[PDB]
């Protein structure tokens, strides 16, 4: 409930207050924090003050005015709505020497083709209109840090998946994606799987963590140190998280995992926040195939196709903090549990805690 806390630029910060924008909601602030941190955001939305301003602020912070080309591209379901966005952007940016434009085209498209050639930091328009001035080469794509899809419900669901995707193609890899929409139906939620990565999801209505999409297995190891040996067998390829219920295990397995050519990332709860943030930035970048850590942040979460419990958490409730789509929202995957002859009980009791089958590992990849 404050902008000043959020270390925004003062030229923008005046614009915010000058535009009249009341201190932002807990939720909005979260989105803004995260857009700025440079994460793909899905943000469920609601009729309320900062509806659009909330992301407009975000795009404006992350702008750099010296670079006089298009750095943010914001697509909306209509010319009209895109003009509102434009005007909003201007208003907030009126103390930033900001340059944006709504591709109305909207005869004259000539004035548009003129306006874009002449330098625009941000650019709004309908997924077509934009895709026009990409084909007509009026809009240079080269230095776009972020794509914003306003009212995705109204676009993504309702005939623009093509128009939008066409644009998407002509943009630098991994350009950042923010999907703002009041509604987020299942139809749209896969959509995002196709252009976002390990996205944050800020939804209005709460969402549990089911166990229901996840195939759970356990490797009867069953004395610690046949656990690494089996892990080694196991990975034979993409991204996965490996939990251990102690920092001592984490470090060991890491130094061993890295003896083996297995590019690794490690984490504790006993690390500062900017550290585990620092780490996960990399792990999410792809530059780590194998995140290993303590729970700490478990009750995390990086959307990951394969999770392994090298150790089984004594506290049962952890189990699904370590593992658990989603619940609507998110992705099925595989858990694998490494179980000491000693820890099979604990497995049975986790099994019973969640009222869930945990079958033995049959040697196959689905």
């Amino acid at each position: 409930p404050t902008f000043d806390t959020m270390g925004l630029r003062e030229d923008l910060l005046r614009g915010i207050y000058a535009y009249g924008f009341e201190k932002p909601s807990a939720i909005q602030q979260r989105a803004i924090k995260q857009i700025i941190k440079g994460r793909d955001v899905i943000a469920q939305s609601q009729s309320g003050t900062g509806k659009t301003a909330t992301f407009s602020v975000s795009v404006l912070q992350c702008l750099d005015i010296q670079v006089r080309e298009t750095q943010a591209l914001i697509l909306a379901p209509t010319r009209e709505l895109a003009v509102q966005v434009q005007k909003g952007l201007l208003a907030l940016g009126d103390y930033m020497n900001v340059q944006c434009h709504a591709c109305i085209g909207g005869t004259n498209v000539g004035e548009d083709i003129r306006k874009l050639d002449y330098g625009q930091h941000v650019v709004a328009g309908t997924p077509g209109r934009v895709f026009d001035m990409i084909r007509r080469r009026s809009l240079r794509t080269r230095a776009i840090k972020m794509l914003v899809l306003d009212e995705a419900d109204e676009m993504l669901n309702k005939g623009f998946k093509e128009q939008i995707y066409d644009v998407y193609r002509y943009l630098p890899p991994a350009t950042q994606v923010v999907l703002i929409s009041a509604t987020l139906p299942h139809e749209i939620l896969e959509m995002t799987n196709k252009f976002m990565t390990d996205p944050i999801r800020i939804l209005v209505k709460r969402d549990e963590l089911t166990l229901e999409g996840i195939k759970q297995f356990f490797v009867a190891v069953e004395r610690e140190e046949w656990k690494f040996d089996t892990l080694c067998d196991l990975y034979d390829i993409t991204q996965a998280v490996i939990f251990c219920n102690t920092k001592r295990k984490v470090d060991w397995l890491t130094e061993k995992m890295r003896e083996a050519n297995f590019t690794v990332s490690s984490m504790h709860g006993d690390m500062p926040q900017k550290e585990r943030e620092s780490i996960m930035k990399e792990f999410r970048s792809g530059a780590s195939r194998v995140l290993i850590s303590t729970d700490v942040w478990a009750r995390d979460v990086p959307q990951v196709s394969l999770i392994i419990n090298y150790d089984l958490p004594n506290n049962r409730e952890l189990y699904i903090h370590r593992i658990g789509r989603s619940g609507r929202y998110g992705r099925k995957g595989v858990a694998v549990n490494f179980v000491k002859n000693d820890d099979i009980r604990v497995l049975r009791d986790i099994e019973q805690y969640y009222s869930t089958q945990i079958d033995e590992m049959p040697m196959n990849v689905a």
């Binding site: 080269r142 193609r169 890899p173």
Partner: peptide, 9 residues
Amino acid sequence: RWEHDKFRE
């Protein structure tokens, strides 16, 4: 899984 082919600076 969308890609950013058909692009080049």
